[PDB]
Amino acid sequence: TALQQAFDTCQNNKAAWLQRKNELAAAEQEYLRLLSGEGRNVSRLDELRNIIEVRKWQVNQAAGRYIRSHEAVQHISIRDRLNDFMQQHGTALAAALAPELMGYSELTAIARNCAIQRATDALREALLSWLAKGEKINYSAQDSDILTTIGFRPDVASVDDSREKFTPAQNMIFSRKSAQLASRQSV
Amino acid sequence: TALQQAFDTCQNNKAAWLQRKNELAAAEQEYLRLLSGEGRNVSRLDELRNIIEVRKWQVNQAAGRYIRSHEAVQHISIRDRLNDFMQQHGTALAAALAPELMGYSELTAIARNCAIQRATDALREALLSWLAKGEKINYSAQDSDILTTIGFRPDVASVDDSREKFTPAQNMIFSRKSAQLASRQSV
Numbered sequence: 001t002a003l004q005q006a007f008d009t010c011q012n013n014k015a016a017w018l019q020r021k022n023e024l025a026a027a028e029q030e031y032l033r034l035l036s037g038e039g040r041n042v043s044r045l046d047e048l049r050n051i052i053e054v055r056k057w058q059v060n061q062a063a064g065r066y067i068r069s070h071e072a073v074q075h076i077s078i079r080d081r082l083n084d085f086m087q088q089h090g091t092a093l094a095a096a097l098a099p100e101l102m103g104y105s106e107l108t109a110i111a112r113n114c115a116i117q118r119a120t121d122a123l124r125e126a127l128l129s130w131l132a133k134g135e136k137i138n139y140s141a142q143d144s145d146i147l148t149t150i151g152f153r154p155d156v157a158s159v160d161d162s163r164e165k166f167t168p169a170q171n172m173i174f175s176r177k178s179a180q181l182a183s184r185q186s187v
Numbered sequence: 188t189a190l191q192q193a194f195d196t197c198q199n200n201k202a203a204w205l206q207r208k209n210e211l212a213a214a215e216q217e218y219l220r221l222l223s224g225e226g227r228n229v230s231r232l233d234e235l236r237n238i239i240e241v242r243k244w245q246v247n248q249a250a251g252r253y254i255r256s257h258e259a260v261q262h263i264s265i266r267d268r269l270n271d272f273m274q275q276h277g278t279a280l281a282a283a284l285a286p287e288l289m290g291y292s293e294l295t296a297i298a299r300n301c302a303i304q305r306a307t308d309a310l311r312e313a314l315l316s317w318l319a320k321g322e323k324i325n326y327s328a329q330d331s332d333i334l335t336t337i338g339f340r341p342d343v344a345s346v347d348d349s350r351e352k353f354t355p356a357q358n359m360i361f362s363r364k365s366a367q368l369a370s371r372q373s374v
Contacts, residue, residue, distance in 0.1 A: 074286045078309050082312070085283050098324055116318075124307060128303075129273065135278070137281050137282055139285045
């Protein structure tokens with residue numbers, strides 16, 4: 001259920017990001033149509049500029065949160081699949097790299113780290129050979145639906161929106177802007 | 188079939204290392220008994236000191252090349268075992284890491300490197316989870332005899348004398364002195 005929990009977390013994050021970008025687009029089109037009009041309304045255009053700026057900041061933050069949630073759900077799926085599969089095949093995987101496993105319990109910390117790094121490097125060449133052979137494969141059978149729905153990669157729109165970042169001072173300034181807009185808009 | 192070559196290389200390296208060790212022991216014991224003896228030939232003492240130092244250098248080099256051969260044969264055995272293991276159960280391994288392996292062909296250098304790094308982190312966490320329970324195992328069935336006869340790690344006597352490092356000029360002058368010793372003892 002934990003994988004399902006992360007899946008629905010990412011789904012509602014995606015929904016929030018989508019509605020945020022829809023609101024941003026509506027604000028932008030309203031601003032441009034008002035600018036096309038003959039009315040001056042300097043205060044109106046200034047407040048619309050502030051609104052669109054804070055809304056695009058919110059869209060960027062939502063995209064970043066969606067990226068983090070997607071990474072989290074992929075990571076938890078990876079860890080659970082690896083745990084269950086290795087439990088099903090503990091002996092085979094252990095004997096594959098056996099000569100560097102005995103004595104691990106009492107091994108010194110530096111030697112322990114060096115041994116596990118050597119094991120990872122040994123698996124690196126197996127992964128390289130597997131990708132060189134380039135066999136076609138899909139997600140795990142047990143959670144194929146969740147992994148297909150979550151997508152192999154996040155949407156490119158979130159990638160380009162999250163490409164640019166902001167300094168923490170601007171982050172907190174925009175957080176205050178969001179708080180005040182929510183406060184004065186609820187009335 | 189390079190495993191057999193590595194095995195016999197390790198065997199003859201061990202034989203040469205034992206020969207160097209026993210000849211060094213003989214040289215040092217005869218030097219000690221001549222020191223305790225009534226003889227006062229200072230030239231004999233100086234030449235015995237030269238023999239002792241050159242034999243110590245030869246033993247150090249033999250230990251170094253034995254360590255290199257042992258690590259080489261261990262790497263070859265690990266590579267072969269992992270290769271046949273992935274040829275046996277590699278599809279399930281690829282499925283377990285599917286969320287970061289799809290479309291590897293068209294990925295750029297940075298994307299491929301990051302995906303490989305994430306896969307290494309995943310397998311590292313799986314390995315540490317497996318090692319947490321401390322499930323004891325043995326050597327690989329196909330090549331158990333070679334691993335047993337080469338040992339899990341080289342003995343202390345092969346590393347305790349190899350903890351001293353020589354500058355390249357020292358190595359060159361010791362090589363020249365060893366060549367002179369061989370030339371003078373051949374006649």
